Amino acid sequence: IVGGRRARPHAWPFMVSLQLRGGHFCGATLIAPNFVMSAAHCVANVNVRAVRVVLGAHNLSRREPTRQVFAVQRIFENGYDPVNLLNDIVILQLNGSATINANVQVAQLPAQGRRLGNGVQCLAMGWGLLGRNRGIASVLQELNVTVVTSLCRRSNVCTLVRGRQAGVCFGDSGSPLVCNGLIHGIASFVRGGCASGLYPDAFAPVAQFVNWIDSIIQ
């Protein structure tokens, strides 16, 4: 997240960090005790059996007892198109079920097909790069963004910060976009580099995949 701010500790208990030996590489959202939702791009070229799903985290640089770590048991895809950057969503079934508490919670999803109008206010978040040249964040970052339909296709939910350069960046892919209390997007891709101030950030439109999601998590 470029130009954002540190989130209050555990302000978003549904926020997930996907990690590999080296550490954080993508975000995710807890949508049920044993299911997380992320971007298909995140697991396209990675050894799923090596991925660690970290719940209840805030500062990735410190050892946190509030954390709960799981492995990926199964993957559910929905037609991800790596060339056109479409259907960038995947559901990862965990090797166990999370203990729901103050630091680990299930997110609320929108109604199937619900679209967001131009002007909707959302909150983007993630442990991605802090700048168009700053590196991965230690403390979870959040950012106020506005939904825009221009310079965006109907197959995406896009957002833009006006009056300054800010937005999601590398490492934020798969992270949730919260709008009106519901997870309406999954960070997918940027254009013109991070926080260009020109191209809106693109997210997978969660609302379009609700019936699919529900068929899997019950």
Ligand X SMILES: *[C@@H]1O[C@H](CO[C@@H]2O[C@@H](C)[C@@H](O)[C@@H](O)[C@@H]2O)[C@@H](O[C@@H]2O[C@H](CO)[C@@H](O)[C@H](O)[C@H]2NC(C)=O)[C@H](O)[C@H]1NC(C)=O
Decide: 39 and 26 in contact? Cβ < 8 Å. Answer: yes
- Smallest distance from ligand X to CB 183, Å: 10
Near ligand X in 121-160, by CB under 6 A: 121-123, 144
The answer to whether 9 contacts ligand X (rule: CB under 6 A) is no
* Residue 173 falls in the annotated catalytic set: yes
Cβ atoms within 10 Å, residue 17: 26
Out of 108, 180, 192, 214, name the contact with ligand X by CB under 6 A: 180
Residue given tokens 């950012």 in the structure block: 143
72 versus 178: smaller Cβ distance to ligand X: 178
5 versus 74: smaller Cβ distance to ligand X: 5
Cβ-closest position to ligand X: 144
Decide: 194 and 137 in contact? Cβ < 8 Å. Answer: no
Judged by CB under 6 A, the stretch of 35-43, 69-77, 173-181, 187-195 that binds ligand X is 173-181
The catalytic residue among 10, 88, 188, 201 is 88
Cβ atoms within 10 Å, residue 6: 15
The catalytic residue among 24, 41, 58, 184 is 41
- Smallest distance from ligand X to CB 4, Å: 11
Length of the chain: 218
- Smallest distance from ligand X to CB 120, Å: 7
87 versus 201: smaller Cβ distance to ligand X: 201
How far apart (Å, rounded) are the C-alpha atoms in residues 55 and 66? 8
**In 3D, which of 199, 179, 120, 189 has the Cα closest to residue 156?**
189
135 versus 181: smaller Cβ distance to ligand X: 181
* Residue 214 falls in the annotated catalytic set: no
* Residue 61 falls in the annotated catalytic set: no
Tokens of 202: 């693109």
Per rule CB under 6 A, count of chain residues that contact ligand X: 8
* Residues lying near ligand X in the complex (CB under 6 A): 121-123, 144, 178-181
Active site residues: 41, 88, 173
